[PDB]
RNA sequence: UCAAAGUUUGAG
RNA sequence: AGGUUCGAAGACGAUCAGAUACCGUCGUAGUUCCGACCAUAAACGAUGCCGACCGGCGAUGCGGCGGCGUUAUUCCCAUGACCCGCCGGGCAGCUUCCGGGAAACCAAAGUCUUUGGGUUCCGGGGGGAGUAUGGUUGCAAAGCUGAAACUUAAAGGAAUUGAC
């Protein structure tokens, strides 16, 4: 889809936020 | 032999109308392909611009068929742009040539600046446009020639437009369209109301009035 | 808003002339408009217009005559420098044979050729043919 | 028209029109027609300036006269009102008629059989007798028309403000045109009235 | 259509044009020398009064105003005749 | 159309709408020359000559030909002042 | 639920009658054999069929006219009863009925004949939405 | 491409309208959109009407009616044949059926 | 619309100056990146050393091997 | 006055 | 603060090859009010704002003017509801060879190679990607700003004939 691809990205960012907050 | 199916045709056959400028004045529709060929027999010359094959999908493959573009002109004043879409190419072509001959139109060709000699360029900068394509003809000074793309060059020569700067935009690639546009340009030379015209029109009888007692053939 | 009076005056007189109107009204009027028209009237493009003195701003009614391909304007009123005036008239007028760029000079509002005679530069207004 | 002295009006003709009710037009005035009207009434009917009506009628007459070989004045009704009237007209005049069901491309088409190539049409209702009126522009045809208030004057080059509705007034308007061409050339004096009846031009509702 | 004397418009169709768009922007309104029945004094109202017009004798009220023209009180005759 | 030698050039001179100074082109088929007859004056009865107006297509399909012709008529004394 | 005739029947039959109304008749077998004489038919069945539709058309003709056909005697009758004239209607005896607006028209056109005026009708309400 | 100028939804000059839950699907829908079928109807319907009027206590009696403004969502209309699809011409012609 | 006025130059100019960086080619010339990214540091050719010969399998519709060199 | 019905040589 | 209904999540019952879904039975948060954040929507007419000009028609909504009749109240007055126009300004509608447009269409999407009324925001093949990174705002969720390397010959719109 597109909506769901956007969701994907926003979750996937949400991980990258969380990994970089470890440092 | 020719047998005129029209009123005008019968007049022309009987050597009643002297030139096709007597027709163009009164803006009569020429429907006989022989009229034009009688007035501009020879001189008038034809060239196939392109054969494009256009094809409609049927349930059992496709009806591939042809479309021959033809321009025609007597390298002096007159040109036409014939398009006929038929099955076998020859039969397409043949019809297009006729369709051009029926189309043909006069060009008012003019001068660039210093008014001397015999007209050579387009009078005023006109355009003809067609389905995204837009063609501008511009008056250009003697010698220049036609500074133009091939397809416009081809007609513009055939018209009797010796010299002309042109520009163009849209999808000039679409040949038929691009010829159609540049044709409608030089058709619109005689449509532009310069001050050179301006003198109140006289009005003449018209062939159908002038030859009234003739047409009712005694 | 109403910004370039001249501009909306010309435009209406051309929009008339397209649609075939015999005469045509124009709703602000000005020295500049008037002056322009007079130049067009000099060269046969329009008829004998006439102007309604409201105790205010103005109103012209121009007798048209179907002779006018297009009366147009150039904003901005660019300064032409005679040098350039040839270039202007080349890429703005439809020929070297008719048309008149009309530019406002020291001398007055006038076609390019009255300007070229007098050898006067000027600011452009508009054009017609 | 030049309703200056000779071919003016006369009390007897106005009495005709009034009776036939050609003046009593329609409710829906088209802006082209505004020109040919005295007034709306109460109710909702635009009454047609009849002097005005005549003036065009005579013009049309003068236009039809101009056609040298009258044959190629081609006359049409589509409606079963003009139907007979326009046949009668062409007979007395010497024009050509087409009563109903105009065959698309009689004015266009070389090939086709009914290819008539006239110099002037006369239609009844430009609304209805319409196909021909559009054809009268692929081939260069001036035109006459019996227009009401309702009518559009698209392509009609010389309108006539009528009651193209009413069968009575239609025949009357065709009969009137018939006189006036005939007067403007040959077999009518003008001092004596015309031997033909207007009633000969009327459409008959199945009566007897 | 295609021909309209914009310099010679008839008053039968200027009356029916907007005060502003009439060739010479006129007003639509008028002053009217009202009488009233009681007083002999002659008050002078304006069609569009927007004020409760009280007399010179100050006996009774003339013009209760509204949207457009003013409502004249009961037995109050008037005349425009001027200008 | 002329060149500097003064000699007429250009292969024909277009007809030109009597309603719009506009040129009835090589293939403006909508156009018309209406010939219209005269009279002697004293008799009615068509006397030889014509009043002959021509109108460009445009104005026909604008539906403004009939108004045009009407107006030309009364410019040549054919139509006798509807008022 | 089957037999419709083709145009090769219906044309022939239409034309035949146009040319031999006289000799043709309602009695089938007579005009079955007429159609053999006057028309050169190739087959028997088609002959026989044509004749059928002929007898179907002879039945219609005996009961007003038909659209796609021309009998000589019908056309003569139609011609007679489309040049009918009684002693005239559009004189509207003495007294034509008329409005004030028409009477005002006729005053403006210089007329005051023998026509009677009548209105009451207040601006009603024409149609309804 | 734009299918209808309208956009099958008679709004024009608003921005928002109360939504209506469809009497069939339950589906949410704009009120202005959504095919609305009012129904008036005799309670009894034409067979049993004479059964009843024979076994009435009341001499004569008028018999009442049953007034229902069903709203339909597009699907639900289209499905239960409350509304067909139409040709490009026909689509434009907004007269009710006779 | 345009800015069009007379004392606009700057606004006009600066606008086009901005919009040049949505022209893919312009950006290639005027951002660094491309110049950095080429192994031929903006050079028409470059010498190198062939550190193996490499089998390049061609793009789908035209099936073949291409024979390349890891320089 | 709405049960279930997924997929389709790389071999031109 | 409150919690009727419905109802993310979650539980069952079905259905299916499987259904962690569609159908059904429960049901948390949420839906509700107040006070504080958040700044996004197909937030759409997918159509920037002001200004002019360029054809009809019927409608409707407010205000105003003008008009003969009805209803009426009580016997007239003054009415309000009707009725028939005109004026301004709205919401739209139909209408056509105005003119445009790749067009479907648009009286604007017109007045454009006959190109300039004023001015703001903006796009520059498709992807990568509204991603990475820096800044900033936010309690969070996220928002605003916003690349490149690399890839790739189309991706796209409109309309046609088919097939389905
Ligand atoms: Mg919204
Ligand atoms: Mg559930
Ligand atoms: Mg919430
Ligand atoms: Mg957004
Ligand atoms: Mg645009
Ligand atoms: Mg531009
Ligand atoms: Mg891109």
Residue at token pair 């290819």: D115
DSSP one-letter code for B83: E
Q: Are E29 and E46 spatial neighbours (Cβ–Cβ below 8 Å)?
A: yes
How distant, in Å, are the alpha carbons of D21, D83, F50, G18, G73 from that of G80?
A: 28, 16, 40, 20, 11
How distant, in Å, are the alpha carbons of D201, F5, H61 from that of D185?
A: 21, 50, 81
β-bridge partners, C60: C26, C51
Chain I residues closer than 8 Å to C77 by CB? 6
Nearest nucleotide relative to C12: CA against C1': K53
Q: Are B123 and B110 spatial neighbours (Cβ–Cβ below 8 Å)?
A: yes
E36 is in an annotated binding site: yes
All residues at 6 or more sequence positions from D141 whose CB lies less than 8 Å from its CB, including other chains: D107, D118, D119, D120, D121, D135, F32
**What's the CA angle centered on D175, arms D173 and D178, to 5 degrees?**
110
Give the strand pairing for H68-72 and H35-39.
antiparallel
For K65, nearest residue by CA–C1' is E68
CA of residue C70 to ligand 6 center, whole Å: 17
State the Cα–Cα distance between residues G106 and G103, nearest whole angstrom. Answer: 5
CA of residue C129 to ligand 5 center, whole Å: 26
**Cβ of residue C11 lies below 7 Å from strand K:** yes
E39 is in an annotated binding site: yes
Both tokens of E15, joined, read 């009356």
CB-to-strand K under 7 Å, chain I 3-62: 3-5, 8, 11, 15, 19, 21-24, 27-28, 31, 33-34, 37
Burial class (CB in 10 A: 0-12, 13-18, 19+), B141: middle
Homologous superfamily of domain range D13-208 = Glucose-6-phosphate isomerase like protein; domain 1 (3.40.50.10490)
State the Cα–Cα distance between residues E64 and E50, nearest whole angstrom. Answer: 8
**Cβ of residue B212 lies below 7 Å from strand K:** no
- What is the separation, in whole angstroms, between the first and last Cα of chain H? 31
Q: Could you tell me the distance in Å between the CA of residue H10 and the C1' of nucleotide K69?
A: 38
Q: Verify whether the Cβ–Cβ distance B32 to D68 is below 8 Å.
A: no
Query: Domain map of chain D by residue range?
Result: 13-208
Q: Verify whether the Cβ–Cβ distance B5 to D115 is below 8 Å.
A: yes
Q: Residue F55: which of E2, B218, G46, D179 has the closest Cα?
A: E2
Nearest nucleotide relative to H80: CA against C1': J1
- For B206, the enclosing helix (H) or strand (E) is none
Both tokens of C100, joined, read 């008149």
All residues at 6 or more sequence positions from D71 whose CB lies less than 8 Å from its CB, including other chains: B216, D94, D95, D96
**Can you give the resolution of this entry in Å?**
3.7
Burial class (CB in 10 A: 0-12, 13-18, 19+), B185: buried
| DSSP notation for D111-179 | SSTT----SEEE-S-TTTSHHHHHHTTTS---EEEEE-SS---SS-SEEEE--TT-HHHHHHHHHHHHH
- F29 to chain B, any CB pair closer than 8 A? The answer is yes
Both tokens of G109, joined, read 């056109």
State the Cα–Cα distance between residues G33 and G39, nearest whole angstrom. Answer: 10
State the Cα–Cα distance between residues G65 and F22, nearest whole angstrom. Answer: 54
CB-to-strand K under 7 Å, chain C 48-87: 69-70, 72-76
Both tokens of C43, joined, read 């060269």
Q: Residue G110: which of B176, B85, D3 has the closest Cα?
A: D3
State the Cα–Cα distance between residues B157 and B144, nearest whole angstrom. Answer: 13
Residue at token pair 């087409």: D98
| DSSP notation for B12-31 | HHTT-S--HHHHHHHTPPP-
Query: Domain map of chain C by residue range?
Result: 1-68, 69-129
CB-to-strand K under 7 Å, chain A 2-21: 5-6, 9-11, 13-14, 16-17, 20
**Cβ of residue I1 lies below 7 Å from strand K:** yes
Dihedral angle of Cα I36, I39, I42, I43, to the nearest 10 degrees: 170
β-bridge partners, C100: C128
At residue F46, the 3 state secondary structure works out as: coil
Q: Could you tell me how many residues make up chain H?
A: 98
Number of the ligand closest to the Cα of H9: 1
CB pairs under 8 A between C and F: 13
Residue of chain C with shortest Cα separation from F19? C20
Q: Residue C120: which of C98, C96, C103 has the closest Cα?
A: C103
Q: Which of E1, E2, E4 is best to mutate for the F interface (most F CBs within 10 A)?
A: E2
Q: Could you tell me the distance in Å between the CA of residue H21 and the C1' of nucleotide K26?
A: 23
Q: Are D106 and D135 spatial neighbours (Cβ–Cβ below 8 Å)?
A: yes
Number of the ligand closest to the Cα of I22: 7
Q: Are C103 and C128 spatial neighbours (Cβ–Cβ below 8 Å)?
A: no
Q: Could you tell me how many residues make up chain I?
A: 71
Phi, psi (deg, nearest 5) at residue F81: 60, 90
State the Cα–Cα distance between residues B68 and B86, nearest whole angstrom. Answer: 8
Both tokens of G111, joined, read 């007329």
Residue of chain G with shortest Cα separation from D51? G109
Q: Verify whether the Cβ–Cβ distance D69 to B29 is below 8 Å.
A: no
- Those residues of chain F whose CB sits closer than 8 Å to some CB in chain D are 29-39, 41-46, 50, 55, 57, 60-61, 63-67, 69-70, 73, 77-80, 82
CA of residue I17 to ligand 7 center, whole Å: 18
- What residues 59-88 of chain D have any CB closer than 8 A to a CB of chain B? 68-69, 71
All residues at 6 or more sequence positions from B176 whose CB lies less than 8 Å from its CB, including other chains: B49, B50, B52, B67, B69, B83
Burial class (CB in 10 A: 0-12, 13-18, 19+), H30: middle
Buried/exposed F3-17: b ≥16 CB within 10 Å, e otherwise: beeeeebbbbbbbbb
State the Cα–Cα distance between residues D30 and F67, nearest whole angstrom. Answer: 13
Nearest nucleotide relative to B124: CA against C1': K114
**What's the CA angle centered on G73, arms G71 and G77, to 5 degrees?**
115
Residue of chain E with shortest Cα separation from C66? E2
- For chain E, the domain total comes to 1
Residue at token pair 């768009």: E21
All residues at 6 or more sequence positions from D171 whose CB lies less than 8 Å from its CB, including other chains: D81, D84, D85, D88, D198, D199, D200, D201, D202, D203
- F28 to chain B, any CB pair closer than 8 A? The answer is yes
State the Cα–Cα distance between residues G32 and G47, nearest whole angstrom. Answer: 7
For K159, nearest residue by CA–C1' is H1
CA of residue H28 to ligand 3 center, whole Å: 19
Q: Are D50 and D17 spatial neighbours (Cβ–Cβ below 8 Å)?
A: yes
CATH number at C69-129 = 3.30.1490.10
Q: Could you tell me the distance in Å between the CA of residue H23 and the C1' of nucleotide K13?
A: 26
DSSP one-letter code for B186: H
Chains touching chain B through at least 3 C-beta pairs below 8 angstroms are C, D, F
Q: Report the interhelical angle of D11-20 vs D50-66 (nearest 10°).
A: 100
- B123 to chain C, any CB pair closer than 8 A? The answer is yes
Q: Residue G102: which of D175, D22, D147 has the closest Cα?
A: D22
State the Cα–Cα distance between residues A15 and D89, nearest whole angstrom. Answer: 94
Q: Which fold has domain C1-68?
A: Ribosomal Protein S8; Chain: A, domain 1 (3.30.1370)
Residue-number span of the structural domain to which E76 is assigned: 1-83
How distant, in Å, are the alpha carbons of B55, E36, E47, E78 from that of E66?
A: 74, 19, 11, 18
């Amino acid at each position: 889809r597109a909506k769901w691809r956007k969701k994907r990205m926003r979750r996937l960012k949400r991980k990258r936020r969380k990994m970089r907050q470890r440092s | 032999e020719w047998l005129p199916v029209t009123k005008l045709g019968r007049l022309v056959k009987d050597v009643k109308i002297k030139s096709l400028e007597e027709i163009y004045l009164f803006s009569l529709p020429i429907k006989e392909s022989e009229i034009i060929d009688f007035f501009l027999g020879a001189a008038l010359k034809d060239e196939v611009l392109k054969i494009m094959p256009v094809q409609k999908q049927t349930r059992a493959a496709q009806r591939t068929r042809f479309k021959a573009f033809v321009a025609i002109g007597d390298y002096n004043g007159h040109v036409g742009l014939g398009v006929k879409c038929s099955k076998e190419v020859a039969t397409a072509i043949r019809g297009a040539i006729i369709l051009a001959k029926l189309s043909i139109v006069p060009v008012r060709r003019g001068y660039w600046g210093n008014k001397i000699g015999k007209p050579h360029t387009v009078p005023c900068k006109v355009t003809g446009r067609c389905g995204s394509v837009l063609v501008r003809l511009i008056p250009a000074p003697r010698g220049t020639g036609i500074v133009s793309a091939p397809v416009p060059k081809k007609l513009l020569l055939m018209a009797g437009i010796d010299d002309c700067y042109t520009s163009a935009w849209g999808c000039t690639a679409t040949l038929g369209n691009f010829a159609k546009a540049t044709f409608d340009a030089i058709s619109k030379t005689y449509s532009y109301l310069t001050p050179d015209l301006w003198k109140e029109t006289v009005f003449t009888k018209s062939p159908y009035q002038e030859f009234t007692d003739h047409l009712v053939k005694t | 808003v109403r910004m370039n009076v001249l501009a909306d005056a010309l435009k209406s007189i051309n929009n008339a002339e397209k649609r075939g109107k015999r005469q045509v009204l124009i709703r602000p009027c000005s020295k500049v408009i008037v002056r322009f028209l007079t130049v067009m009237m000099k060269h046969g493009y329009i008829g004998e217009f006439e102007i309604i003195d409201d105790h205010r701003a103005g109103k012209i009614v121009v007798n048209l005559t179907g002779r006018l391909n297009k009366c147009g304007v150039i904003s901005p009123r660019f300064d032409v420098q005679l040098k350039d005036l040839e270039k202007w008239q080349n890429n703005l007028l439809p020929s070297r044979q008719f048309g008149f760029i009309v530019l406002t000079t020291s001398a007055g509002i006038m076609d390019h050729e009255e300007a070229r005679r007098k050898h006067t530069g000027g600011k452009i207004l508009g054009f017609f043919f | 028209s030049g309703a200056l002295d000779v071919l003016q009006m006369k009390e007897e003709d106005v009495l005709k029109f009034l009776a036939a009710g050609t003046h009593l037009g329609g409710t829906n005035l088209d802006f082209q027609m505004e020109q040919y009207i005295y007034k709306r009434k109460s109710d909702g009917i635009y009454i047609i300036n009849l002097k005005r009506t005549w003036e065009k009628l005579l013009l049309a007459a003068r236009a039809i006269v101009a056609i040298e070989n009258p044959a190629d004045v081609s006359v049409i009704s589509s409606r079963n009102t003009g139907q007979r009237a326009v046949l009668k007209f062409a007979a007395a005049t010497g024009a050509t008629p087409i009563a109903g069901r105009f065959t698309p491309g009689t004015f266009t088409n070389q090939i086709q059989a009914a290819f008539r190539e006239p110099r002037l049409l006369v239609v009844t209702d430009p609304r209805a007798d319409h196909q021909p009126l559009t054809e009268a522009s692929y081939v260069n045809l001036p035109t006459i028309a019996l227009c009401n208030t309702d009518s559009p004057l698209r392509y009609v080059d010389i309108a006539i403000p009528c009651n193209n509705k009413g069968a009575h007034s239609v025949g009357l308007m065709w009969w009137m045109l018939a006189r006036e061409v005939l007067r403007m050339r040959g077999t009518i004096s003008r001092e004596h009235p015309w031997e033909v009846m207007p009633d000969l031009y009327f459409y008959r509702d199945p009566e007897e | 259509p295609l021909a309209k004397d914009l310099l010679h418009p008839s008053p039968e169709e200027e009356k029916r044009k907007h005060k502003k768009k009439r060739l010479v922007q006129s007003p639509n309104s008028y002053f009217m020398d009202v009488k009233c029945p009681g007083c002999y004094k002659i008050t002078t109202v304006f069609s569009h009064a927007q004020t409760v017009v009280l007399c010179v004798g100050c006996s009774t009220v003339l013009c209760q105003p509204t949207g457009g023209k003013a409502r004249l009180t009961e037995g109050c005759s008037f005349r425009r005749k001027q200008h | 159309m002329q060149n500097d030698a003064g000699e007429f050039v250009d292969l024909y001179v277009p007809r030109k709408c009597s309603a719009s100074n506009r040129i009835i082109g090589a293939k403006d088929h909508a156009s018309i020359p209406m010939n219209v007859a005269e009279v002697d004056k004293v008799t009615g009865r068509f006397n030889g000559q014509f009043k002959t107006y021509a109108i460009c297509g445009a104005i026909r399909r604008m539906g403004e030909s009939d108004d045009s012709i009407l107006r030309l008529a009364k410019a040549h004394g054919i139509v006798s002042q509807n008022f | 639920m089957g037999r419709v005739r083709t145009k090769t029947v219906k044309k022939a039959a239409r034309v035949i009658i146009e040319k031999y109304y006289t000799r043709l008749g309602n009695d089938f077998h007579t005009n079955k054999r007429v159609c053999e004489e006057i028309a050169i038919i190739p087959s028997k069945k088609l002959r026989n069929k044509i004749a059928g539709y002929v007898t179907h058309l002879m039945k219609r003709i005996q009961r007003g006219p038909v659209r796609g056909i021309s009998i000589k005697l019908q056309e003569e009758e139609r011609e007679r009863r489309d040049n009918y004239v009684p002693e005239v209607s559009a004189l509207d005896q003495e007294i034509i009925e008329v409005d004030p607006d028409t009477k005002e028209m006729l005053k403006l056109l210089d007329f005051g004949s023998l026509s009677n005026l009548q209105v009451t009708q207040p601006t009603v309400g024409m149609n309804f939405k | 491409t734009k299918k209808r100028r309208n956009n099958g939804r008679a709004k024009k000059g608003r921005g928002h309208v109360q939504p209506i839950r469809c009497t069939n699907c339950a589906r949410c829908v704009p009120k202005d959109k959504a095919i609305k079928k009012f129904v008036i109807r005799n309670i009894v319907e034409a067979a049993a009407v004479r059964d009843i009027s024979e076994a009435s206590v009341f001499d004569a009696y008028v018999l009442p009616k049953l007034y229902v403004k069903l709203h339909y969502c597009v699907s639900c209309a289209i499905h239960s044949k409350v509304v067909r699809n139409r040709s490009r011409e026909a689509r434009k012609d907004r007269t009710p059926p006779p | 619309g345009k800015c069009r006025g007379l004392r606009t130059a700057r606004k006009l100019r600066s606008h086009r100056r901005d919009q040049k960086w949505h022209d893919k080619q312009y950006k290639k010339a005027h951002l660094g990146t491309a110049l950095k990214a080429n192994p031929f540091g903006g050079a028409s050719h470059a010498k190198g050393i062939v550190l193996e010969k490499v089998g390049v399998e061609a793009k789908q519709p035209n099936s073949a091997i291409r024979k390349c060199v890891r320089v």
